[PDB]
Structure formats: structure tokens, C-alpha cells
Design a protein around this ligand. Structure first.
Ligand SMILES: NC(=O)C[C@H](N)C(=O)O
Ligand SMILES: [Zn+2]
Ligand SMILES: [Zn+2]
Length: 374
């Protein structure tokens, strides 16, 4: 016989496919880490060496895209002892994360972008999709190449810049330095084919989003580039984030915070406020604090259970919404052409199998592919 296993053909059949938009019992043909077919009832012999897998009675949706992870570690806000460790591959793949955006937090003295870049690339080699934000709470930003615009532009894995405002751990940035920073991220993005966003870590200051509004006055960076996070950290601020989302901006809610506005409670209030889910994403801020990624899947579950969101609508803030905000071409959605980043769940939404770019990451709910030193 002839050898065709080079194509790594795999057919996920008979599952209740949510892409996230609720389709029916659809089949998904995968080849070379790519979804090459999506139409109910596909032949188990349509292609040669095809690893056919029976997912009858199971749910099939896109893997999660988590855009807030301290990949190489974080913390340190209470001495060097509080410096959290780096993130383990299995930790991510088990929480159903197939695409992630790394970043640095408060500590930008013992944590450098070159290391994050390195960890991001190491992750991509191991099986998942990783990107990173340059800078840290600090403004002006400590970059790799000398300027934010240059980083976003020519460093292949940088998709935008991060920073921190209305927080007691900022660098006390002024509107000009802030505006300039975002403008560089925006221009850089265009030159590099990157979303060129600016993610703002929100603190507990009364000022809240005022700096983000002040910025809009002093420059012309589209509001579709300014992403505030941890908006659910205090109610007064959350309320403003909603108003900000009502103006066309997107808001990021961290699943690692459970009060005063819980994650689900957050995604929920937004809908009630009348915000298209498109402008709402959910991040974990994993390995921060030591934060974990369990709360991502838990926010989906609780959304479908405790609140009255549907499986499809619950998934959005963790997939398509995120994908559409960073312009992560080929992700967060199951269609021919897109990447075979998949999650096999039980009817009760309990991740059983995980697929990343075709390769199988989680077999029995436990990763079967791990980082080099786990
Ligand atoms: N001090 C804090 O509230 C923690 C910080 N917001 C973090 O992202 O971990
Ligand atoms: Zn933060
Ligand atoms: Zn953080």
C-alpha cells in the first residue's frame, strides 16, 4: 500500500457541533492541522489513512483563546518569593486553551519581553498557538527593539502593547505618553499585520476609564483598539466599562476575579445592558495573583447552568469574540480553512478531549502531550 499518514487525516463524527453558533450533529474532517470539511455525515473512507473517531453524544466546539496569561511567570508584588512560576503546557491544554496571548504584569525588572517571546515560541513548537503583548504596567514601555511601534511591527509574535492605568502600581503615566504608546501599537500593527491593540490593566482608582477617554481626545487611535481588562474588579468601574462597550469598544472580564462582579455575572450584565457579545471577551490572568485557568471553563458552565445563556452564546466571549478582536485569522471558529483547535465535551460541558492544530493534547481529560520538563 501507499503511505498517506503524512496528512494526518482525522474525522470527528457524530458530535453536537457548536462553532460556536449551534449547528446540529455535524462532522469535521481534519487534515494537516486544518479543518478541511464541515458538513453533516462525512464518509469514514472519504480520505485514505483517516483516524476516524466516534464522538456520538459528545459536544464539539472551538478551543479557548485566553488573551491574558503571564506565560513566563508574574507576581513579585511582595518580594522575590512571590514571583510565580512559568506556565505549564498541560495546564493550558487541560483548561481547554488552544491559543493564548502572553504578557507581563507589575514586575518588569526581573521579567523581560525576550523571555516571554522565548516562552511564546516554545509553546508554539510544543503544539499550541501563542502570541504576546510587549511592555508591562510600566509606561513608557520597556520594549525589545527600542520602541513599541517597532516591536509590534517587526517582532513576529507581538500583537500589541500592554500597560496599566488607574492603579496604585502604575508608573503614573500622563495622557501624552499614553496616547503615543497606543498610536505606536496601532501603526506597528498595520506594518506587521497585527491587531496593534493596547491592553489596559485596570486598577481600583476612582478615575477608572477616564484616562482611556482622555486618550481618545488627544489622538485618533480607533476605540476598537483600546481594551481595558479586569473591568469586573469594582462595580463603579464595571459600570463605566459597560458604557465604554456601548460606544463600540470591547471589554475584557477576568475569570480570576469573583467579586464584586463575578465572571458570569459580568458577561450576563453586559447582555442585559444590550451589548453585542462580540464586544465582550473573557480572560484568565492565569499564573498571576497563583491564578489558574479552571475559571475559564467554569464561567462557561455556570453561564449555561446558573444563568440562562446558551452553549453557543456562552462560548463566544472565549472564542469568536476574542478571535475577532485580535484578528486571530483562522481561530475561535470551526469552518473549512480555520485551524483544527477543538474541544470534545460531555453534554454537561466537561472537556474530555482537546485538539490543537490537529494534534491531540488531552485524551481522558488529562493532557497526553506535555512541555519538555513537566
Ligand atoms: N493587585 C491586584 O489586584 C492583582 C492584579 N490586578 C493582577 O492582575 O494580578
Ligand atoms: Zn493585570
Ligand atoms: Zn495581569
Amino acid at each position: 500500500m501507499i503511505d498517506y499518514t503524512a496528512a494526518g487525516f482525522t474525522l470527528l463524527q457524530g458530535a453536537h457541533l457548536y462553532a460556536p453558533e449551534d449547528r446540529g450533529i455535524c462532522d469535521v474532517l481534519v487534515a494537516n492541522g486544518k479543518i478541511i470539511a464541515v458538513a453533516s455525515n462525512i464518509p469514514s473512507d472519504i480520505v485514505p489513512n483517516c483516524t476516524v473517531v466516534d464522538l456520538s453524544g459528545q459536544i464539539l466546539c472551538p478551543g479557548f483563546i485566553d488573551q491574558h496569561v503571564h506565560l513566563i511567570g508574574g507576581g513579585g508584588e511582595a518580594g522575590p518569593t512571590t514571583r510565580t512560576p512559568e506556565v505549564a503546557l498541560s495546564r493550558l491544554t487541560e483548561a481547554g486553551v488552544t491559543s493564548v496571548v502572553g504578557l507581563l504584569g507589575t514586575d518588569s525588572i526581573s521579567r523581560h519581553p525576550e523571555s516571554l517571546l522565548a516562552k511564546t515560541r516554545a509553546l508554539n513548537e510544543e503544539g499550541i498557538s501563542a502570541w504576546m503583548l510587549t511592555g508591562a504596567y510600566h509606561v513608557p514601555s520597556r520594549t525589545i527593539t527600542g520602541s513599541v511601534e517597532k516591536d509590534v511591527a517587526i517582532i513576529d509574535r507581538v500583537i500589541g502593547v500592554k500597560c496599566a492605568i488607574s492603579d496604585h502600581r502604575s508608573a503614573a503615566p500622563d495622557v501624552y505618553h499614553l496616547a503615543n504608546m497606543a498610536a505606536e501599537s496601532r501603526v506597528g500593527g498595520l506594518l506587521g499585520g497585527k491587531p496593534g491593540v493596547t491592553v489596559f490593566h485596570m486598577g481600583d482608582s476612582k478615575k477608572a476609564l477616564q484616562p482611556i477617554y482622555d486618550l481618545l481626545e488627544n489622538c485618533d487611535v480607533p476605540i476598537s483598539k483600546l481594551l481595558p481588562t479586569h473591568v469586573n474588579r469594582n462595580v463603579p468601574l464595571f459600570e463605566q466599562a459597560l458604557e465604554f462597550a456601548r460606544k463600540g469598544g470591547t471589554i475584557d472580564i477576568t475569570s480570576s476575579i469573583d467579586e464584586p462582579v463575578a465572571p458570569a455575572e459580568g458577561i450576563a450584565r453586559a447582555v442585559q445592558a444590550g451589548i453585542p457579545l462580540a464586544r465582550v471577551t473573557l480572560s484568565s490572568d492565569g499564573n498571576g495573583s497563583v491564578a489558574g485557568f479552571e475559571t475559564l471553563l467554569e464561567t462557561v458552565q455556570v453561564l449555561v447552568k446558573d444563568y440562562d445563556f446558551s452553549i453557543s452564546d456562552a462560548l463566544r466571549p472565549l472564542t469568536s469574540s476574542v478571535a475577532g478582536f485580535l484578528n486571530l485569522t483562522g481561530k475561535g471558529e470551526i469552518l473549512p480553512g480555520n485551524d483544527a483547535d477543538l474541544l470534545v465535551m460531555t453534554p454537561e460541558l466537561r472537556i474530555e478531549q482537546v485538539y490543537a492544530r490537529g494534534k491531540l493534547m488531552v485524551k481522558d481529560g488529562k493532557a497526553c502531550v506535555k512541555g519538555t520538563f513537566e
